[PDB]
């Protein structure tokens, strides 16, 4: 039985990446949303921030003082992967409590939808990593 631990980055109600590391995590997610400010809008003001910040990479100003782009609409959730790929927990919580707490169908009363939320929980930490 082997058990490994991801943290599940929810942005803007899509995924980000799986990691296991805070500075690996936290510096994917805040390289990939300031890239897609760079689109032009605050690109420039982007370049000059990591300039003025003394800094090579978005990377190395994320570990270096931990600070970034980050707002409260950033949603982490951290979740667990067996070692074969297959989920089996996620948020410390099994995902059978998931899919009644919010499709709020029962094993017994539907097992039909129970396993349509179970693959569609699946789906948000397999595919959350594109």
């Known amino acids: 039985m082997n058990n490994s631990i991801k943290f599940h980055v929810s942005y803007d109600g899509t995924a980000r990446a799986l990691f296991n590391t805070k500075e690996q995590a936290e510096k994917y997610c805040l390289v990939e949303e300031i890239n897609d400010e760079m689109n032009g809008y605050?690109?420039?003001?982007?370049?000059?921030?990591?300039?003025?910040?003394?800094?090579?990479?978005?990377?190395?100003?994320?570990?270096?003082?931990?600070?970034?782009?980050?707002?409260?609409?950033?949603?982490?959730?951290?979740?667990?992967?067996?070692?074969?790929?297959?989920?089996?927990?996620?948020?410390?919580?099994?995902?059978?409590?998931?899919?009644?707490n919010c499709y709020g169908f029962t094993l017994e009363d539907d097992l039909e939808e129970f396993n349509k939320a179970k693959q569609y929980l699946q789906k948000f930490y397999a595919e959350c990593e594109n």
């Open 42 to 100: 605050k690109r420039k003001s982007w370049e000059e921030k990591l300039r003025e910040e003394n800094c090579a990479s978005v990377q190395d100003w994320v570990e270096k003082n931990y600070t970034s782009s980050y707002s409260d609409l950033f949603n982490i959730c951290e979740i667990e992967v067996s070692s074969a790929g297959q989920l089996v927990k996620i948020d410390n919580t099994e995902v059978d409590d998931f899919v009644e």
